[PDB]
Coordinates of C-alpha atoms in Angstrom, one line a residue:
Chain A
X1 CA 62.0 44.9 162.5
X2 CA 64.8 45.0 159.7
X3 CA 64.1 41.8 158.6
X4 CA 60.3 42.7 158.5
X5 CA 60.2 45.4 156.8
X6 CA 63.0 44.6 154.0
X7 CA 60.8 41.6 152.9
X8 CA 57.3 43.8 152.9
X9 CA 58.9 46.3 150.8
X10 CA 59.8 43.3 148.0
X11 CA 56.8 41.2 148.8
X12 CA 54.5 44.4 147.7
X13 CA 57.0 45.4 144.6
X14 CA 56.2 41.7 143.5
X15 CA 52.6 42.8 143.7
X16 CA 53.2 45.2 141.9
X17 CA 55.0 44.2 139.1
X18 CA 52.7 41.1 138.8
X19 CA 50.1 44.0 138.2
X20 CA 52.3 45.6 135.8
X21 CA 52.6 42.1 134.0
X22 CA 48.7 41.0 133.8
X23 CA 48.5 44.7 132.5
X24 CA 51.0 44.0 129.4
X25 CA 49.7 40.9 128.2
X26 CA 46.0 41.4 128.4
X27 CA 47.5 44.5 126.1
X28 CA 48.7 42.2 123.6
X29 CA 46.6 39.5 123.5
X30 CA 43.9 42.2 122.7
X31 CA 45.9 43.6 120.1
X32 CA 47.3 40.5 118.7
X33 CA 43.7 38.7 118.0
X34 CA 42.7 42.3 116.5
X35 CA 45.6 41.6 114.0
X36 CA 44.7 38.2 113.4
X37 CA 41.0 39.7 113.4
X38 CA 42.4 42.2 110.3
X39 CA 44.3 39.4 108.3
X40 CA 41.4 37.7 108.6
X41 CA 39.0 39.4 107.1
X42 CA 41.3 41.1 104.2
X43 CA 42.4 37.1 103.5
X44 CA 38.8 36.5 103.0
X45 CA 38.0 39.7 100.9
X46 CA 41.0 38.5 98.6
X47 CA 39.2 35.0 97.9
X48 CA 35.8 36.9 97.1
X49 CA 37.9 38.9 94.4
X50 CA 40.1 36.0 93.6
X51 CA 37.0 34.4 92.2
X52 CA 35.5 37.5 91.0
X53 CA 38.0 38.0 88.6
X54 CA 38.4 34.3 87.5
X55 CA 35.2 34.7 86.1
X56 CA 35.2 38.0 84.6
X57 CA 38.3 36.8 82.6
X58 CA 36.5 33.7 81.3
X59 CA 33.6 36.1 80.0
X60 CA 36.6 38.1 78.4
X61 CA 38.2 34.9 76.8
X62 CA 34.6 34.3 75.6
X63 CA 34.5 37.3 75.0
X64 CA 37.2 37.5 72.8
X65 CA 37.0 34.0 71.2
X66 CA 33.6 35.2 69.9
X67 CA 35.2 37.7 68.1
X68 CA 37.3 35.8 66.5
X69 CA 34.9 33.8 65.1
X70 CA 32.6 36.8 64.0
X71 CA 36.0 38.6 62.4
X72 CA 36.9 35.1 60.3
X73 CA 33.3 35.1 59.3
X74 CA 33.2 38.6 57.8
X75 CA 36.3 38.1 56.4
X76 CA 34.0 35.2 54.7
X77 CA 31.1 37.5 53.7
X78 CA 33.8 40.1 52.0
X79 CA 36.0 37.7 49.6
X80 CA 31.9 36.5 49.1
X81 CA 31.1 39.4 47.8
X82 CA 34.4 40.9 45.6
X83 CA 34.5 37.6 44.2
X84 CA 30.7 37.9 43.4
X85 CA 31.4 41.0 42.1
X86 CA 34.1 40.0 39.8
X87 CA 31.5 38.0 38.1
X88 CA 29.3 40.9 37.9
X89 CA 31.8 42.8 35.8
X90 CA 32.4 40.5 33.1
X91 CA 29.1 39.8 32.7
X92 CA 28.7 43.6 32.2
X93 CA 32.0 43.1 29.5
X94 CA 29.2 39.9 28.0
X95 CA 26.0 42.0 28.2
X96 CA 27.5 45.2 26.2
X97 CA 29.4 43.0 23.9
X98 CA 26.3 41.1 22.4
X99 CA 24.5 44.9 23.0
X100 CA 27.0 46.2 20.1
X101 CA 26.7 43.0 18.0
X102 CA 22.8 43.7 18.6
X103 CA 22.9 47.3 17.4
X104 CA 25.6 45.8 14.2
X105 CA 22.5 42.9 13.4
X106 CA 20.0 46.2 13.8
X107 CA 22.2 47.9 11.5
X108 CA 22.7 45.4 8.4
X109 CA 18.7 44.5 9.0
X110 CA 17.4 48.1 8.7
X111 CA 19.9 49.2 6.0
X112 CA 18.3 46.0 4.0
X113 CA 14.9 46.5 4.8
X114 CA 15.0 49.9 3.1
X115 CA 16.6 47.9 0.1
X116 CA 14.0 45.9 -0.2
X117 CA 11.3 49.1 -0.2
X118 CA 13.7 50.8 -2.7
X119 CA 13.3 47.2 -4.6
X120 CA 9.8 47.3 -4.3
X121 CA 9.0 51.0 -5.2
X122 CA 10.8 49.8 -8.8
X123 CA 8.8 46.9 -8.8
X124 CA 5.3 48.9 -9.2
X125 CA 6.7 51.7 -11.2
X126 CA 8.0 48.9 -13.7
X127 CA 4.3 47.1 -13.2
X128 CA 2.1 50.0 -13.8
X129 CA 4.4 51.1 -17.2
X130 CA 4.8 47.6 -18.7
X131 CA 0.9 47.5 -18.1
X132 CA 0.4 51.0 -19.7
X133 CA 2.5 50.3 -22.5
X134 CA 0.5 46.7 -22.9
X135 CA -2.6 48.6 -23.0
X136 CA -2.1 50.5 -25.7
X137 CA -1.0 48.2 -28.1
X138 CA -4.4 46.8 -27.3
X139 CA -6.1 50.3 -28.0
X140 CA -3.7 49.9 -31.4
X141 CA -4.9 46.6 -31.8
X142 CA -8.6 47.3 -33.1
X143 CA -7.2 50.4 -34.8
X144 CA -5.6 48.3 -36.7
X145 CA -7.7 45.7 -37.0
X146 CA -10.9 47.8 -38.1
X147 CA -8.0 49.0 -41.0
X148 CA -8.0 45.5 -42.7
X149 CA -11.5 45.4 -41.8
X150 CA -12.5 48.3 -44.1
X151 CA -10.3 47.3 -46.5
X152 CA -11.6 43.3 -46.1
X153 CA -15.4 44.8 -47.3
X154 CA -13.9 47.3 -50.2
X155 CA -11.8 44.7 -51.9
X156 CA -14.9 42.5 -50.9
X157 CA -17.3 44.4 -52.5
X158 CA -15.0 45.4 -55.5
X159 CA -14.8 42.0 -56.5
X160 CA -18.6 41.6 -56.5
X161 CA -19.2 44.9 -59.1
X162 CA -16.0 43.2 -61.0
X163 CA -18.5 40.3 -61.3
X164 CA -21.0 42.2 -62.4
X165 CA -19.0 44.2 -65.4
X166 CA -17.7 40.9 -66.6
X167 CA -21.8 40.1 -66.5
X168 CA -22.7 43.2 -69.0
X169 CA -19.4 42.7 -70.9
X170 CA -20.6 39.3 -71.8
X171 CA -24.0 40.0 -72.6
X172 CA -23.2 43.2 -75.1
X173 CA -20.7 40.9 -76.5
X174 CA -23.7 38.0 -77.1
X175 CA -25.7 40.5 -78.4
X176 CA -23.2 42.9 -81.0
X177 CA -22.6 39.5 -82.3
X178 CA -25.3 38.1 -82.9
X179 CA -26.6 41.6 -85.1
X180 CA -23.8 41.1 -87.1
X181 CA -25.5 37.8 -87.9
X182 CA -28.9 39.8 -88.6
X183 CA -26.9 42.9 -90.3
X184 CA -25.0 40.1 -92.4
X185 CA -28.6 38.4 -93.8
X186 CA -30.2 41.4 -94.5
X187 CA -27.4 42.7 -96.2
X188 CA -27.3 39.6 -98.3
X189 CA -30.9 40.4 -99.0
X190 CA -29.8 43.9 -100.2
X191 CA -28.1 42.3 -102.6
X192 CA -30.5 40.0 -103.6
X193 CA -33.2 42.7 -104.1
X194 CA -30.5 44.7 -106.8
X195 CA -30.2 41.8 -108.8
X196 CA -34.3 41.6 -109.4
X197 CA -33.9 45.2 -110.5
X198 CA -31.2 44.5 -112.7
X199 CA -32.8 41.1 -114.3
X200 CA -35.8 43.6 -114.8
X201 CA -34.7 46.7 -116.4
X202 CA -32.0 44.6 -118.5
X203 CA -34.4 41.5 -119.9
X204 CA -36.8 44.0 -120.6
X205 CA -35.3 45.3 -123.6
X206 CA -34.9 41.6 -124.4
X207 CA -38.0 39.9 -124.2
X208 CA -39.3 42.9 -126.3
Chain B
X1 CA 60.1 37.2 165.1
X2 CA 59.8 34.0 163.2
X3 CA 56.0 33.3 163.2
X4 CA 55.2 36.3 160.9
X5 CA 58.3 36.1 159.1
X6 CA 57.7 32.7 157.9
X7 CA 54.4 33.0 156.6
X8 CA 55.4 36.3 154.6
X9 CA 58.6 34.8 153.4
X10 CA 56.3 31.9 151.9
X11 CA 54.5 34.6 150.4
X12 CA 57.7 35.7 148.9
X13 CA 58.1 31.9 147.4
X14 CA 54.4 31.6 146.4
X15 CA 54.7 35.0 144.5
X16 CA 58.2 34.2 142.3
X17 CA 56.9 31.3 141.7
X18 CA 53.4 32.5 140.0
X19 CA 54.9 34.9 137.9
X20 CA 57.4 32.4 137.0
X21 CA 54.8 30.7 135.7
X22 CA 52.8 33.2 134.3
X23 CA 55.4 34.6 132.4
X24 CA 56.1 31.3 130.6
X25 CA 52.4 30.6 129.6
X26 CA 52.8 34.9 128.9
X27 CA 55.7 34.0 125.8
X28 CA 53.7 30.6 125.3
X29 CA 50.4 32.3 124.7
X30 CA 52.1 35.5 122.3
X31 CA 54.2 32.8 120.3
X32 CA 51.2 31.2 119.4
X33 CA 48.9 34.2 118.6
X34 CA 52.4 35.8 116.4
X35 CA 52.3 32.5 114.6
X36 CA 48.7 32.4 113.7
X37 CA 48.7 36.1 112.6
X38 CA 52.2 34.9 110.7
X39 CA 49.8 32.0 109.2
X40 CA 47.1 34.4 107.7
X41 CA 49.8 37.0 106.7
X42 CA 50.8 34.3 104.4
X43 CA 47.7 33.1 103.5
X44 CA 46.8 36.7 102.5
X45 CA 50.3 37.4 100.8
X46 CA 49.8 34.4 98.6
X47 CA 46.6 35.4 97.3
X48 CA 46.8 38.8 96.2
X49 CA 50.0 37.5 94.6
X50 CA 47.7 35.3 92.5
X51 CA 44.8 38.2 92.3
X52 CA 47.4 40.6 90.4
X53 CA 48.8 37.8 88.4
X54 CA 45.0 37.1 87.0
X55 CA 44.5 41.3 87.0
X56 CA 47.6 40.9 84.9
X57 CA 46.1 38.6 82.7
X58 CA 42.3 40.4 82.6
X59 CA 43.9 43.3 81.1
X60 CA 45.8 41.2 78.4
X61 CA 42.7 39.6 77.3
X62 CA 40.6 43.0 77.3
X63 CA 43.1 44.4 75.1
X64 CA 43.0 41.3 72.8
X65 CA 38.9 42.0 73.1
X66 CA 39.6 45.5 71.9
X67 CA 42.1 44.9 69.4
X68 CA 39.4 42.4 68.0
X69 CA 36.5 44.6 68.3
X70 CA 38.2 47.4 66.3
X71 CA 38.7 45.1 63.8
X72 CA 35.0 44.0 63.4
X73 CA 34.2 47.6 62.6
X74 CA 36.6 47.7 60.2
X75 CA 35.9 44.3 58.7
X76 CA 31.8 45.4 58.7
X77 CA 32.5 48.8 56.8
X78 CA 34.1 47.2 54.0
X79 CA 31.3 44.9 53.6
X80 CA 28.7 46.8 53.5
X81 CA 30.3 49.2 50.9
X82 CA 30.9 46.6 49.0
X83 CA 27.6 45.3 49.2
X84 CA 26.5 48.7 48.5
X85 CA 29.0 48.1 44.7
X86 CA 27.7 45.0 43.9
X87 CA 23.8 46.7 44.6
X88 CA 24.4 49.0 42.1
X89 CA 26.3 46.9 39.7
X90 CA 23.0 44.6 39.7
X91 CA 20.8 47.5 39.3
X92 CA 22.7 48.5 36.0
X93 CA 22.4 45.0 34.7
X94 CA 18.9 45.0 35.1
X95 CA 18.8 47.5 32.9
X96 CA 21.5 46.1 30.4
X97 CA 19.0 43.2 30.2
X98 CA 16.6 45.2 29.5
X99 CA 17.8 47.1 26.9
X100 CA 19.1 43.8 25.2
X101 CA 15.2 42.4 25.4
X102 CA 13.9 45.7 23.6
X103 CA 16.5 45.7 21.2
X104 CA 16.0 41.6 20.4
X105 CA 12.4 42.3 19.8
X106 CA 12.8 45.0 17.4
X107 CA 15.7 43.0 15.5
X108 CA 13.2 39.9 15.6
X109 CA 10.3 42.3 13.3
X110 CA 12.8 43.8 11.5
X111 CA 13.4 40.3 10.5
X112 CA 10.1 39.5 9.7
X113 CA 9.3 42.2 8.0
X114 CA 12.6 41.9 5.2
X115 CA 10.8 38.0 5.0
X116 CA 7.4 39.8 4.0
X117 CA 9.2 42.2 1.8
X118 CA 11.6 39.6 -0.2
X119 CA 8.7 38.0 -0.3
X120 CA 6.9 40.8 -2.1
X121 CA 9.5 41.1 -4.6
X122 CA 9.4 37.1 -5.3
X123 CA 6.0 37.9 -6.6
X124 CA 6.9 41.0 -8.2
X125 CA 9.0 39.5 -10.8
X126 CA 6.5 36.8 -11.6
X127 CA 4.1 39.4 -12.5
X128 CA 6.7 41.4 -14.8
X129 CA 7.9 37.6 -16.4
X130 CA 3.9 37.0 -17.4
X131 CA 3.2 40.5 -18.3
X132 CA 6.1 41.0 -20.3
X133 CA 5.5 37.6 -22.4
X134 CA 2.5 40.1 -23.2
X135 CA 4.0 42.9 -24.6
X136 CA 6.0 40.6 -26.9
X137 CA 3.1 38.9 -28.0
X138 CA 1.7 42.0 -28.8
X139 CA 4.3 43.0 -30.9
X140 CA 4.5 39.9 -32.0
X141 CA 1.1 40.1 -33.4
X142 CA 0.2 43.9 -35.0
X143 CA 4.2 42.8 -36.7
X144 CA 1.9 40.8 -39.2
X145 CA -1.2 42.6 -38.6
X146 CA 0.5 45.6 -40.8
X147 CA 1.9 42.8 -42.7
X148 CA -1.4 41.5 -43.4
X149 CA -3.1 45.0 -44.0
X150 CA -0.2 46.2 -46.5
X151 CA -0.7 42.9 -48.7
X152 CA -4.5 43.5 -48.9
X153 CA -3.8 47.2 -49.5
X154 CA -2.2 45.9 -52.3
X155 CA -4.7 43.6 -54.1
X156 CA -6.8 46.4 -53.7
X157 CA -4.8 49.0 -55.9
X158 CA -4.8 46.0 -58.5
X159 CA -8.5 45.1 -58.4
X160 CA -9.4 48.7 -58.4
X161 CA -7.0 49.6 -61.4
X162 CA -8.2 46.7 -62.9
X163 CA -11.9 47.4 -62.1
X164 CA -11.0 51.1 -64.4
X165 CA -9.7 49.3 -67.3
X166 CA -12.5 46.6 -67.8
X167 CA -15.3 49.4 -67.3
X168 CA -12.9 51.1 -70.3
X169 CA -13.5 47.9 -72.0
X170 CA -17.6 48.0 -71.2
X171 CA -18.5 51.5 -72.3
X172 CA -16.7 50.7 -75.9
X173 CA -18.3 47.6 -76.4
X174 CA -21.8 49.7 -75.4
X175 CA -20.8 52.6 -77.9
X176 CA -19.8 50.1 -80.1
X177 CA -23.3 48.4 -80.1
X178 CA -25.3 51.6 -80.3
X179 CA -23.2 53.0 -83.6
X180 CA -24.0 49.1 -85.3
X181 CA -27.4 49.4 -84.2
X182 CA -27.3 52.9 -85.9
X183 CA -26.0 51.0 -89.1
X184 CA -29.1 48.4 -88.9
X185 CA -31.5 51.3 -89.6
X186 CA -29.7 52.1 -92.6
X187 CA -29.9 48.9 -94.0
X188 CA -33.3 48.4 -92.9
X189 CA -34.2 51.6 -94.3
X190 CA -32.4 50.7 -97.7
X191 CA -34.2 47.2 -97.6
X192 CA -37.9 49.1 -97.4
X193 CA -36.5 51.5 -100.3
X194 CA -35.0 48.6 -102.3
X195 CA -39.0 47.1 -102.1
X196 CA -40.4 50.6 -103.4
X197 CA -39.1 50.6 -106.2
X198 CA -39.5 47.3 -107.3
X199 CA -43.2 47.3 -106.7
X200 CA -43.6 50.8 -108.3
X201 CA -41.9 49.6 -111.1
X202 CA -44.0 45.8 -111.3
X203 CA -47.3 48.1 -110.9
X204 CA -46.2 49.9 -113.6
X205 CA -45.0 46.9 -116.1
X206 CA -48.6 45.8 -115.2
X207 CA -50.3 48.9 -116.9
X208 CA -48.5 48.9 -120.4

């Protein structure tokens, strides 16, 4: 009876407590594999990520290298173009130097151009009066000319009537000479005839 | 009794031993599930330690992408703007070229027309040399044309002086002539008288 009955009383509080037990752990083992069930999946979501990001950084480090190629090449284009400016100005300083030593040339050539015209304008005004002057000592020319001309035929014909008066000067001369021959005979016969009137009236007185 | 008891008192010994048992392969079974869960904690640990360490460096490399890309901006404005210099510095030496290439034609006419014009006064003193040998001439000439005319005027003024005296010398030989012939009829007249009156006195000797 007392034996009995102290045993039952342990022999269903092991029953119990075994019930108890099973309870606890198929507790834990539930909640434990739901932990590892939690790690697991937030381990795995770290290795989609932990890839994710490798790659966006090497798009990055692309990313940026390609800049720095693009930034070394502008660089490049600007030094290109200052430099190729530089040029540009002193060939401006070259084009407006020989522009003013064009506009000194245009200068010198114009300013003797116009001596030349003012050379030329005295080289017609001294043509048309040397051949002025030249033409009238031309027009004097026969002026004079016809001068000796007239005086050519007066002299000319002068000399041909002092031809002629030495012509009647001789023949007058021939003839008052030769009367005097005729006046001397008859004047001898004059004489001649007073002498028969002198033998005449003188012998008369004579003879008887 | 002892029948009953015996068969519950094996029940006591076949109890304590089963949880015995079951609470060894109870710690057994939770120290394996802590340790797998204490795996994948560590798993996990050790990767987001190397996520942030490449979020860490993603950031570093983004800011070295933007540093870059500011730069390129920078590096493109001054370019273009100098570009836009170097545009405009051509476009004004197109037109410095231009000017030049008017400006060397007109100086290049220019020069040909001061060749024309020296050219015109080569000539224009060969005219004046042969035209002036003229005028010389000229005066060269009517010189001894009134040289010539002045000797002849005076050979006239002696011919024609001359010419006055030998008609002097004609009309007194013709006077001269008629007063002798005037003479003759006196002696002729006398010679008929002289012959009257020597016949009158014959014809009368012949009477008595």
């Amino acid at each position: 009876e007392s034996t009995v009955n102290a045993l039952t009383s342990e022999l269903r509080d092991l029953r119990a407590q075994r019930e108890e037990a099973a309870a606890a752990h198929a507790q834990e083992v539930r909640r434990l594999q739901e932990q590892a069930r939690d790690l697991g999946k937030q381990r795995d979501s770290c290795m989609r990520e932990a890839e994710e990001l490798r790659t966006q950084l090497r798009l990055m480090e692309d990313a940026r290298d390609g800049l720095r190629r693009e930034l070394l090449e502008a660089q490049r284009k600007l030094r290109e173009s200052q430099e190729g400016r530089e040029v540009q100005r002193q060939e401006a300083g070259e084009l407006r130097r020989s522009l003013g030593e064009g506009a000194k040339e245009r200068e010198a050539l114009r300013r003797s151009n116009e001596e030349l015209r003012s050379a030329v304008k005295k080289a017609e005004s001294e043509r048309i009066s040397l051949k002025l002057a030249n033409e009238d000592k031309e027009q004097k020319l026969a002026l004079l000319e016809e001068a000796r001309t007239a005086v050519g035929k007066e002299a000319g014909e002068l000399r041909t009537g002092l031809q002629e008066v030495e012509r009647s000067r001789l023949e007058a001369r021939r003839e008052l000479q030769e009367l005097r021959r005729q006046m001397k005979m008859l004047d001898s016969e004059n004489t001649r005839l007073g002498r028969e009137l002198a033998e005449l009236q003188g012998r008369l007185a004579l003879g008887e």
